[PDB]
Amino acid sequence: TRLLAISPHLDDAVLSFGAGLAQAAQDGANVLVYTVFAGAAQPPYSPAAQRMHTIWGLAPDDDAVLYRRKEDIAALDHLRVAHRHGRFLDSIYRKLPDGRWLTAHVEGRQKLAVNDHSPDSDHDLVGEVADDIRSIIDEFDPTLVVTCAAIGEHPDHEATRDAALFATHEKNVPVRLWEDLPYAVFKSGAVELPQGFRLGSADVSSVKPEMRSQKFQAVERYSSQMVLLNGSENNLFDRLDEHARQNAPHGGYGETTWPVVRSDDS
Ligand SMILES: [Zn+2]
Ligand SMILES: [Zn+2]
Ligand SMILES: [Zn+2]
Ligand SMILES: [Zn+2]
Ligand SMILES: [Zn+2]
């Protein structure tokens, strides 16, 4: 078994599929967690990025990507799985063709506003990510790829998922999508895949209690994210535990995945 996980951001694979990754390595699978939006960003940073860096507990002009890469290595080391950090710049570091920042701040609103941009610019981003994924597939030779469903409709999650779907289709590798966490605790669960792809029936895994514990310890390595993840009530793990409790109310901890298959008549 050669499992390639494709995470949009530094933390998504561990939050959503950490237990499955740790279980996979335990069973003797070769596991690799490649993160798409891990590109090394250079100053000058935008105001919106600077603000994010402060929310992550960093100085505005700190090398934030380096810090987050280090956290990611620690967390994946904890699950006993390998890492690979991609070249793509996260949303807060990207500029548009016209020279504007992709993301700007508004006064008095929590979530950052994304500037409108061309379908061409999205097609091109997704194309480049797909290119990188295809090469990784050639290099690593996965038997299975797992990536995000993009529940919550984060644009970087959709870009990652879509590129993985195009690349895995061309390369004939089976692909599964994980339920995005903690997004799925806050957002419905229905997603729109690119034309020609659809979701098969869900599978909610059964993991040993010790893999649950390892997952949550791995999550704790993302120190920069604890404020963003614990939110208001400081109860991320409670919410994660409660979610898994529902989806197996006669079992313990587990993670929801769906296989991706071709639609009929496509
Ligand atoms: Zn993410
Ligand atoms: Zn490394
Ligand atoms: Zn992003
Ligand atoms: Zn876009
Ligand atoms: Zn769910």
Side-chain angles (χ1 to χ4, degrees), residues 10 22 36 84 105-107 128 134 186 199 219 260:
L10 299 159
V36 178
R84 188 170 171 144
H105 201 26
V106 191
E107 181 64 20
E128 293 260 350
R134 280 194 311 268
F186 304 109
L199 290 178
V219 171
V260 182

Side-chain angles (χ1 to χ4, degrees), residues 151 179 181 184-185 187-189 204 243-244 246-247 256 258:
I151 285 157
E179 178 184 40
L181 298 174
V185 166
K187 306 271 178 169
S188 48
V204 182
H243 188 91
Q246 304 154 189
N247 286 336
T256 299
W258 300 266

Side-chain angles (χ1 to χ4, degrees), residues 151-177:
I151 285 157
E153 304 170 51
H154 198 296
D156 294 337
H157 287 214
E158 290 179 351
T160 295
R161 176 202 64 199
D162 292 0
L165 295 178
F166 301 142
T168 57
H169 185 227
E170 294 168 78
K171 295 288 176 184
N172 294 290
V173 34
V175 63
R176 291 190 71 88
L177 309 176

Side-chain angles (χ1 to χ4, degrees), residues 116-264:
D116 293 301
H117 46 279
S118 66
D120 273 19
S121 70
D122 283 338
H123 188 92
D124 289 349
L125 182 55
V126 172
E128 293 260 350
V129 179
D131 256 64
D132 280 27
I133 293 169
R134 280 194 311 268
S135 294
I136 291 168
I137 283 167
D138 285 346
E139 188 181 323
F140 179 74
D141 203 17
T143 53
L144 172 67
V145 162
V146 184
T147 195
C148 60
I151 285 157
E153 304 170 51
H154 198 296
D156 294 337
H157 287 214
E158 290 179 351
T160 295
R161 176 202 64 199
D162 292 0
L165 295 178
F166 301 142
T168 57
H169 185 227
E170 294 168 78
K171 295 288 176 184
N172 294 290
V173 34
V175 63
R176 291 190 71 88
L177 309 176
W178 64 62
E179 178 184 40
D180 308 61
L181 298 174
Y183 292 85
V185 166
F186 304 109
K187 306 271 178 169
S188 48
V191 291
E192 190 90 37
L193 300 191
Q195 222 59 214
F197 295 96
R198 76 165 172 92
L199 290 178
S201 300
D203 171 89
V204 182
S205 76
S206 278
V207 310
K208 289 282 162 181
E210 296 85 3
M211 317 313 167
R212 171 196 166 274
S213 173
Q214 187 176 17
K215 170 184 183 167
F216 288 9
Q217 290 157 10
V219 171
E220 287 183 330
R221 272 70 187 154
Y222 300 101
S223 297
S224 66
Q225 299 315 286
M226 284 313 94
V227 159
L228 212 62
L229 294 168
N230 278 305
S232 311
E233 312 287 332
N234 267 101
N235 62 341
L236 177 73
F237 301 118
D238 290 337
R239 285 184 274 106
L240 294 180
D241 279 329
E242 177 64 23
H243 188 91
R245 193 205 62 74
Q246 304 154 189
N247 286 336
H250 331 288
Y253 196 74
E255 287 151 347
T256 299
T257 60
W258 300 266
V260 182
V261 301
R262 294 293 291 176
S263 296
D264 292 348

Side-chain angles (χ1 to χ4, degrees), residues 37-38 42 65 80 111 131 250 256:
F37 297 95
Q42 304 216 309
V65 176
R80 313 185 75 161
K111 164 72 184 165
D131 256 64
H250 331 288
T256 299

Side-chain angles (χ1 to χ4, degrees), residues 8-9 37 89-92 94 154-157:
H9 301 114
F37 297 95
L89 295 173
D90 197 16
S91 71
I92 44 161
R94 301 201 292 278
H154 198 296
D156 294 337
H157 287 214

